[PDB]
Design a protein around this nucleic acid. Structure first.
Ligand SMILES: [Zn+2]
Length: 66
DNA sequence: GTCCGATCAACTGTAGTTAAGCTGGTAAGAGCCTGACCGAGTAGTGTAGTGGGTGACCATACGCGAAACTCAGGTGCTGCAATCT
């Protein structure tokens, strides 16, 4: 019955599946996958991949500062 | 059913508590297989009774033959009479 809302969810899924998400990411994000830092003496955690990418990019910035 | 927005804690910035396994000599979990003990399972059994069909012996029936019994056929003389002589 929620027809325009269903169209909104459907087209938004199709957008997000084109915006580099493998789909298996959307599954893993419900299952319990937190991303975690891998750098020396970093261990911080994120509930979305964009926040993890920003955090790893801040480590690239740290390497550039050094 | 839905509307406002307060509000436990969702998800978000760094400061300080948790194993694993090393030297050992060691008792602690988690365990294995043979054995024993009763409950229940697999299922053919143990008397006991209802029915049925086989077998023997009988008598009843007809139908053909066997001997019985009744009633009338058949033999042969001669007492008496009649034809031929
Ligand atoms: Zn990090």
């Amino acid at each position: 019955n929620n027809n325009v809302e269903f169209l909104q969810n459907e087209v938004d899924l199709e957008k997000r599946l084109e915006s580099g998400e493998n789909g298996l990411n959307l599954l893993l994000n419900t299952v319990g996958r937190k991303y975690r830092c891998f750098y020396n003496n970093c261990s911080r955690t994120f509930k979305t991949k964009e926040k993890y990418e920003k955090h790893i990019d801040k480590h690239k910035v740290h390497e550039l500062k050094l």
